[PDB]
């Protein structure tokens, strides 16, 4: 049985800049966690009612955490700080996106600064590109040489998830399932 419980029922999720990917192959897919869903469900290139009748070579399970106002970017042909600098989906993305409000899990009263996201990057991310570099971003004309100052900022910032914030600033756990010998039936 394909390990879908380990991805959705995970106690701790990864940051969007360092999104985790679970390579799932050679298994029987008990489509039930996505088959029926406070659960958002966006599919691209494939129908869910036809997933039980299709065999795939590999199925990738990408999981991370963003805020509510950024879930709209986890889609093909989207731009923004999350899409361009954290997690990008290709234009011909074949798969589904799942996201749910996790304000009762990833938000502390004193702020949950554990989840991070990438602010600055010299160029946009390619589809399915993961950049965990923490080099001081050079914005100006002078070099930085690992110095945090003017025009040389940390490329990562914290989300600070507090439960008293609006829905657009509450944590949302996202699970992106990509459908690529066909073994995942």
């Amino acid at each position: 049985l394909c390990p879908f419980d380990e991805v959705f029922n995970a106690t701790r999720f990864a940051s969007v800049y360092a999104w985790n990917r679970k390579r799932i192959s050679n298994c029987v897919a008990d489509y039930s966690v996505l088959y029926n869903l406070f659960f958002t469900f966006k599919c691209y290139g494939v129908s869910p009612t036809k997933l039980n009748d299709l065999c795939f070579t590999n199925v990738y399970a990408d999981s991370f955490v963003i805020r509510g106002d950024e879930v709209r970017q986890i889609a093909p042909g989207q731009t923004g700080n999350i899409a361009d600098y954290n997690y990008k989906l290709p234009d011909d993305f074949t798969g589904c996106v799942i996201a749910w409000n996790s304000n009762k899990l990833d938000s502390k009263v004193s702020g949950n600064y554990n989840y991070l996201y990438r602010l600055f990057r010299k160029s946009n991310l390619k589809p399915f590109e993961r950049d965990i570099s923490t080099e001081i971003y050079q914005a100006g004309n002078k070099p930085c040489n690992g110095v945090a100052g003017f025009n040389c900022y940390f490329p990562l910032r914290s989300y600070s998830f507090r439960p008293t914030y609006g829905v657009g600033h509450q944590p949302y756990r996202v699970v992106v399932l990509s459908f690529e010998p066909a073994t995942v039936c």
Epitope: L119, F120, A139, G140, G149, F150, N151, F154, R157
Partner: antibody, heavy 123, light 108 residues
Framework: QVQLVESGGGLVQPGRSLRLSCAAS????????MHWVRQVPGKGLEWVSG????????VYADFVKGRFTIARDNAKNSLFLQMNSLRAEDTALYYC????????????????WGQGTTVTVSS | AIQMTQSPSSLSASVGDRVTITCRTS??????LNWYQQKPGKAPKLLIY???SLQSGVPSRFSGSGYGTDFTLTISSLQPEDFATYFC?????????FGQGTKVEIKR
């Protein structure tokens, strides 16, 4: 409350010098970058200079060249701007601004502004 | 440099109207555009930072949007006390240049 107050403005002949001060209260001055912003009578805001919390990062707009010098005294919760070789186009009301984003991130905004001090360069 | 061009330079609207101010950048500044409000004879006050984040204490009728270029400030319901001058200011690269400003007037 958070508060900033500028001082030191007044008349100065062209070519002479003037020293501006900015007194801060109601927040941890040592943790935030500070800025100088000016405004020509009738024109828009113009950024002048900024300085990091530990003074390790110091900047000037090109119209400043090597005439002005920004500095701060974290023990006295004061920001300073030493203005030399003042010209007629330096006539403006000068604001002192605190940066919202804590520590070494000056890419968000100035939440707190003083009432400003007026500098007029004329013979 | 990072020239900031605002449009319009001046506008006249009544109480309750929806006002939208446009701010363009000479190059991409990602999402670090800031909006400020300034009354005649008063100091500027921060409204929006990081293109869309509302500053604490600012009424919810103010809202910002945009990414890269062509940023927009929106006042959903104009009130009498919104008469001022609205500046946009990029924070991607030094100098933290300001826009030319958009003076909002009210009619009665």
């Amino acid at each position: 409350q958070v508060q900033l107050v500028e001082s030191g403005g007044g008349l100065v002949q062209p070519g002479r010098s003037l020293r501006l001060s900015c007194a801060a209260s109601g927040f941890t001055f040592d943790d935030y970058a500070m800025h100088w912003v000016r405004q020509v009578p009738g024109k828009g805001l113009e950024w002048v200079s900024g300085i990091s919390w530990n003074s390790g990062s110091i900047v000037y707009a090109d119209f400043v060249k090597g005439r002005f010098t920004i500095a701060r005294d974290n023990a006295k919760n004061s920001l300073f701007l030493q203005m030399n070789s003042l010209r007629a186009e330096d006539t403006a009301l000068y604001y002192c601004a605190k940066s919202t984003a804590l520590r070494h991130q000056y890419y968000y905004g100035m939440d707190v502004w003083g009432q400003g001090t007026t500098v007029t360069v004329s013979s | 440099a990072i020239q900031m061009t605002q449009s319009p330079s001046s506008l006249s609207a009544s109480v309750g109207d929806r006002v939208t101010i446009t701010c363009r950048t000479s190059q991409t500044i990602s999402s670090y555009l800031n909006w400020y409000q300034q009354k005649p004879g008063k100091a500027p006050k921060l409204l929006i930072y990081d293109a869309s984040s509302l500053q604490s204490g600012v009424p919810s009728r103010f809202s910002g949007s945009g990414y890269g270029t062509d940023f927009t400030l929106t006042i959903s319901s104009l009130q009498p006390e919104d008469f001022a001058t609205y500046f946009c200011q990029q924070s991607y690269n030094t100098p933290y240049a300001f826009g030319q400003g958009t003076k909002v007037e009210i009619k009665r």
